[PDB]
């Protein structure tokens, strides 16, 4: 029992079960399928969901808060969306619910990132159509020749107490607009690393203070990882982020792994047995046993669609 290979899916976890949905391969994976990976046993279970099932999408943004799945955005066969769904997995047959949220939602987009803080889901960045909204938008000129698309640096809050969208008034210098960056939350710090913007897959590291809404840039002393998009960034402790895979400005698929030590502001390269298994647009989830479970994604330049090496392998890192 194993799910088909795919890139651009979502994977969220409670530390024990990892829920996999969506993505595409070589096209979109079946919308009603929810794959559950037991991190302790290593076994899969497919279930068919009901209710307001989202369309099959890549680049959607999902979270698991107290075993409630939330999903925003993505790209389906007719383009980007800004719909918001929730799937309670706490129990019966799982039923999707499309949440008609109050307030101004974000623009339709995919390949963004989210931080979870108290009752708030905080979404940053992504790629989609021209957006009233705070922040900046920057067109992708390769989309001009349909609807043009571009990157944003937008921060949006969905307050789960009321399912109301809003935007915080931030201080500091936001990261540039970007997509396929990776976000990770530790405490009240929402970290974002890398991502694609114009002609670069970037190497910069920021966090947004989720209490005071101040942006900070982190300059680590010493060797930093090469700039990338489509990588994963995973909290593995109150003081370490785990970086794996991605895709460089020069289209190199990556298999390096690093841990960022927050308190020392330092990157440490991480040796592992998958140096011959680069992955981009995979997912990664931390286990309660201190592991990082990488699933899916593409082993080569997925931009050459007819040659794309999509994967269904589980990679287990012991951090």
């Amino acid at each position: 029992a194993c799910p088909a290979e795919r890139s651009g899916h979502v994977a969220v976890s409670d530390g024990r079960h990892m829920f996999v949905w969506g993505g595409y391969k070589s096209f979109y994976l079946p919308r009603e399928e929810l794959w559950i990976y037991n991190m302790e046993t290593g076994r899969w279970k497919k279930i068919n969901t009901e209710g307001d099932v989202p369309p099959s999408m890549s680049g959607s943004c999902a979270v698991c808060v107290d075993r409630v799945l939330y999903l925003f955005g993505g790209h389906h066969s007719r383009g980007n969306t800004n719909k918001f769904y929730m799937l309670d997995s706490r129990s019966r047959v799982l039923q999707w619910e499309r949440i008609d949220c109050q307030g101004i939602p974000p623009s339709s987009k995919d390949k963004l990132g989210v931080w979870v803080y108290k009752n708030k889901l905080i979404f940053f960045g992504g790629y989609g159509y021209l957006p009233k909204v705070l922040g900046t938008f920057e067109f992708d000129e390769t989309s001009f020749w349909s609807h043009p698309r571009g990157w944003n640096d937008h921060v949006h809050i969905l307050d789960t107490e009321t399912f109301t969208w809003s935007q915080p008034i931030t201080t500091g210098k936001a990261p540039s607009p970007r997509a396929a960056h990776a976000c990770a939350t530790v405490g009240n710090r929402g970290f974002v690393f890398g991502g694609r913007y114009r002609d670069a897959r970037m190497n910069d590291l920021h966090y947004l203070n989720l209490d005071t809404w101040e942006w900070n840039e982190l300059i680590p002393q010493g060797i930093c990882p090469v700039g990338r998009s489509w990588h994963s960034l995973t909290p593995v402790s109150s003081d370490h982020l785990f970086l794996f895979g991605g895709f460089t400005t020069d289209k190199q698929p990556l298999s390096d792994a690093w841990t960022y030590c927050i308190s020392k502001n330092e990157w440490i390269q991480f040796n592992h047995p998958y140096t011959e298994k680069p992955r981009l647009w995979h997912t990664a989830c931390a286990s309660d046993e201190g592991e990082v479970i990488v699933f899916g994604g593409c082993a080569n330049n997925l931009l050459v669609h007819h040659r794309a090496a999509h994967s269904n392998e589980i990679l287990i890192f012991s951090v």
């Binding site: 651009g8 595409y24 890549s58 680049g59 790209h75 995919d110 390949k111 790629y127 992708d140 390769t142 989309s143 698309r149 571009g150 990157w151 997509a179 396929a180 694609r196 998009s229 489509w230 895709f247 647009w281 997925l302 931009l303 669609h305």
Partner: peptide, 6 residues
């Protein structure tokens, strides 16, 4: 399609 902008 899905991969643009990354």
């Amino acid at each position: 399609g899905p991969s643009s902008g990354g």
